[PDB]
Design a protein around this ligand. Structure first.
Ligand SMILES: NC(=O)c1ccc[n+]([C@@H]2O[C@H](COP(=O)([O-])OP(=O)(O)OC[C@H]3O[C@@H](n4cnc5c(N)ncnc54)[C@H](O)[C@@H]3O)[C@@H](O)[C@H]2O)c1
Ligand SMILES: NC(=O)c1ccc[n+]([C@@H]2O[C@H](COP(=O)([O-])OP(=O)(O)OC[C@H]3O[C@@H](n4cnc5c(N)ncnc54)[C@H](O)[C@@H]3O)[C@@H](O)[C@H]2O)c1
Ligand SMILES: NC(=O)c1ccc[n+]([C@@H]2O[C@H](COP(=O)([O-])OP(=O)(O)OC[C@H]3O[C@@H](n4cnc5c(N)ncnc54)[C@H](O)[C@@H]3O)[C@@H](O)[C@H]2O)c1
Ligand SMILES: NC(=O)c1ccc[n+]([C@@H]2O[C@H](COP(=O)([O-])OP(=O)(O)OC[C@H]3O[C@@H](n4cnc5c(N)ncnc54)[C@H](O)[C@@H]3O)[C@@H](O)[C@H]2O)c1
Ligand SMILES: O=C(O)c1ccccc1C(=O)c1ccc(Cl)c([N+](=O)[O-])c1
Ligand SMILES: O=C(O)c1ccccc1C(=O)c1ccc(Cl)c([N+](=O)[O-])c1
Ligand SMILES: O=C(O)c1ccccc1C(=O)c1ccc(Cl)c([N+](=O)[O-])c1
Ligand SMILES: O=C(O)c1ccccc1C(=O)c1ccc(Cl)c([N+](=O)[O-])c1
Lengths: 267, 267, 267, 267
């Protein structure tokens, strides 16, 4: 197994189409022992993660809750056993209020909404690293999820801004994590048909926003030299496991693109 | 004059070493008629701007104040006369609480502090565009100030993250401004010895943070193929005026580097 | 005039749709005194440049001819008068044999053809700087023409590779030019309907290559927040003059995008 | 083994400090069956590769020799057996005449020398892909070696330009390779003390060029959040094997940085 013997925390499962669900499944297939964290609907999340190939302890973590973060390391150590540390951490968390995405005009998003989205989607990457680095082994790996924000696009709006912030946060987290012998990187994935994404294409955030996201998805597969299957998160999950493994040992502060090569092609 | 007949709003003057003070001076030398905006210390700012080559109306603008922003367009129109519109807008505004910069550990900045810094330094670029685009002429220009955040560095810490967000905001503001025939761009300047910068090098944010910023400044002049004079903001001011003029008419959503060429050289 | 009193060499005119023809016209409108260089068809080029607003001496320059390059500085000094130096140099030169572009498979371009294209399109930027820097004034400006090669695209093929090389060459030319007080930069233009470009869209390099270039042009105007008019080279010419002026005095080794903002937008 | 059962061609071994020697060693440790290619000194190369953990057939390949390239696929098939195809190809080849590197002035490199360096270092990546893609399996991987050329630097000079060209070539090779189900990527490594590199630091290309390269190496380890050991090529070799494996299945046309994170940090 690629991750045999490694102890890895995976955040961000909410449904069986969550990117983090497939990260967790592939990691377990590769021998990793997992600790899961979930937000708000913990009964639902437990029922979802019962379908993973192996049982895993589930801990509550709202990344806006300073008490959850202050206790997180101790709860993880209780789950994996005293004297054991984590080898990996997966941040697979995002949120932006509806005013910050969709046909809702970019200029009409109130800052309270934008600030909440940047808190959950970018600042919390630093929050989780702060909480967990003291219980991570040298040679460890922190990985977060990205959507390439280097160019503007329709509908993503303030979530794009939050991803630009996250990429910057990742480069500073790498500075801190390096003191522990730990790497920090992001995986920039192409579009994946999660439940939230399927709802947006169906028009949950306005019709023309849904139309624009559908055109974005089509252009992605067209641009990708090896194609892009938005219905299959496994290539993204394998890329996250590659970063969690010992096989990218000199990469940190960086972004790995699991997007079919689409960002390397103009058309 | 490069800006003869143009009506341009300039924010961000606080002392005579403010980058915006030199933007305003050069713009007036080139024939522009200015409206100035200032924050908090308006008595001080009026006394500072009395030294500009021409008189200019001074309006109060705290970019965190929704009432200031909601009234801004009407107060500008009163200042320049009904039936007149702006040709240019300069955003030269930044702030990050001390916990977000310096020797203060990156992980120890509370989100309330970071969110305030991102509000003032990044979100407000969209706020000012929202307020002022309805009173801007086609062919107009919005310019904001940037410090290249594409790589992490010592001490800049969460202000770097705010600049990463600002660059993303600029690309979305360009989308909105294009509907008005208006361009939006940032000038990424090299380090300039403002009062705040001089204080930081003197150790106001911790000794080793000051030591690191001094080493950053020295490397900048070394890297720049034409050199870099941190005591001279005029090259930055001229670059802002170039973007405010009609001579970069096909550039928008973009970043112009007024840094001596330092970002193009590794060493 | 933006360029009043400046002495500027402009290469690359071959027809009245040449980007360099419009660079020269705008520069003369702004008070510059020009020296022109032309390749192979000097009778044709003289007849074309007779239509510029002012007379200008025309010198022969094949950038693959070491004798033309070794004599160029002396011929320029003869044209502008002893004791006079150049303030500006415009490189607006490109060529790639047909095997290196179009439907002709990327793998089938022989290296002899590719090497000729890289010689004319990239190496010659260093050749011209070597020849002309000894007769350039401090504060001078060298500008070359670019087409953004950061992503692959259909048909451009090995010309894309040549532009990637040119961007690298520009950063090294900036190092050398800085010793003379001279800046070096590229303007990355959007697509312009030159005679060669019109022929390619008409299918001169294969039908599907023409189809792909037409789709590229359409997407460009769609992406550009201020639009893009491929029939109008004046915005590109003005951007070149901006770099030749004193108004971007701290930019070197760099690329200015005169593309409507298209490269800042995904769709 | 990470590469169990895979058949992989590895070019570029010349001494036991060659990056390709360590790529080959790690690949064999991970279960790959290798075919090696070598240039000019095949007796020497055979003696060097006798020290690899497993025997491997050695084929002659001068990438400037069209006859070597036209016969390469048939010689590989003979070596691995009819009906067998390659799963991986490693391009680890570079050369630039001395006039193109070191204290030798950038402007003094003759184009014949530069063209030879671009032939060997960049064009040959397309040449090898053209020769070998017809005998590669779907799911295969082509990997080449890069040194980040996005900024100019002392001494690397025209080799930097060749790497800029190589990055562009890689994006076009990805387009062709995708038709075969094959990925193409580069690994941008930090500095490694090969025999050639040790000689350059010792002054083989001029004293100040050696001084500048030594300062470059020191800054690299300083910048890298996890450090950088120029005496240890194993982290680079493991990264190449990661790309040769099935664990980065949605990455193509891309660059993976095995540099300690140095390129993500300003200082
Ligand atoms: N689906 C795509 O197209 C795509 C593409 C690239 C990147 N990503 C990224 O992957 C991450 C989310 O992935 P997803 O697509 O699997 O969607 P998802 O809805 O399945 O996952 C979002 C997760 O964020 C978690 N979350 C929200 N608020 C939280 C909080 N206060 N505390 C803790 N967790 C919280 C949700 O509970 C949920 O588990 C995000 O970073 C997203 O941007 C998604
Ligand atoms: N000095 C440098 O080295 C440097 C380099 C690159 C970019 N910049 C950028 O230039 C901008 C600030 O420039 P400066 O260096 O001239 O420093 P400065 O201290 O002279 O200007 C900062 C300005 O921000 C304004 N400001 C702060 N809070 C505000 C609010 N709530 N509402 C309105 N205005 C507010 C201040 O009043 C002040 O006028 C910033 O965007 C800064 O990041 C500076
Ligand atoms: N037209 C576009 O879409 C576009 C877009 C961006 C950049 N550019 C760039 O602008 C430059 C060429 O511009 P153009 O579009 O105006 O086409 P053009 O055909 O009008 O100009 C090409 C010029 O290259 C010159 N040239 C060719 N070989 C030469 C040699 N051996 N010595 C000296 N000169 C030689 C030609 O004589 C001709 O004057 C090129 O660098 C091109 O890549 C063009
Ligand atoms: N050593 C470093 O610091 C470093 C860093 C990043 C990337 N790289 C890259 O790794 C590759 C070379 O690696 P190295 O550092 O292991 O040096 P090396 O001297 O050990 O390898 C160079 C290889 O190029 C081969 N070669 C030269 N001409 C050839 C030809 N005509 N045909 C076939 N092969 C030819 C040599 O025979 C030799 O095997 C190059 O692409 C180099 O740029 C090196
Ligand atoms: O990114 C998120 O965290 C997110 C938050 C809420 C809803 C969906 C997403 C999401 O993953 C996403 C990915 C790509 C695109 Cl193109 C869009 N989009 O423009 O709608 C969304
Ligand atoms: O950027 C700002 O708005 C700002 C806010 C407060 C104090 C100074 C600055 C500032 O302009 C700045 C520029 C460059 C650098 Cl390197 C630093 N720094 O690291 O300290 C600061
Ligand atoms: O770039 C050149 O120098 C050039 C050489 C010969 C023919 C045309 C061009 C040219 O300018 C060009 C610009 C954009 C595009 Cl998209 C293409 N293209 O793909 O065909 C060509
Ligand atoms: O890159 C090559 O192929 C190469 C060719 C000949 C000699 C050494 C190298 C080489 O690998 C290299 C790597 C980094 C640096 Cl910084 C330098 N350098 O500036 O001398 C060389």
């Amino acid at each position: 197994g690629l991750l045999d013997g490694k102890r890895i925390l995976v955040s961000g499962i909410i449904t069986d189409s969550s990117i983090a669900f497939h990260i967790a499944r592939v990691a377990q297939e590769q021998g990793a022992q997992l600790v899961l964290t979930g937000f708000d609907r913990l009964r639902l999340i437990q029922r979802i993660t019962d379908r993973l190939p192996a049982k895993a302890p589930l801990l509550e973590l709202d990344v806006q809750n300073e008490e959850h973060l202050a206790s997180l390391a101790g709860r993880v150590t209780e789950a994996i056993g005293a004297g054991n540390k984590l080898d990996g951490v997966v941040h697979s968390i995002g949120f932006m209020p509806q005013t910050g995405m969709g046909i809702n005009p970019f200029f009409d998003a109130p800052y309270a909404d934008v600030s909440k989205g940047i808190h959950i989607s970018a600042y919390s990457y630093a929050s989780m690293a702060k909480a967990l680095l003291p219980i991570m082994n040298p040679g460890g790996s922190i990985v977060g999820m990205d959507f390439d924000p280097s160019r503007a696009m329709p509908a993503y709006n303030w979530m794009t801004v939050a991803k630009s912030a996250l990429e910057s946060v990742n480069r500073f987290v790498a500075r801190e994590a390096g003191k522990y012998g730990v790497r920090s990187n992001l995986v920039a994935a192409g579009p994946i048909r999660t439940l939230a994404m399927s709802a947006i294409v169906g028009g949950a955030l306005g019709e023309e926003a849904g139309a624009q996201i559908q055109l974005l998805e089509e252009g992605w597969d067209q641009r990708a030299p090896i194609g892009w299957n938005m219905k299959d998160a496994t290539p993204v999950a394998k890329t996250v496991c590659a970063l969690l493994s010992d096989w990218l040992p000199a990469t940190t502060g960086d972004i790995i693109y699991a997007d079919g090569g689409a960002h390397t092609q103009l058309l």
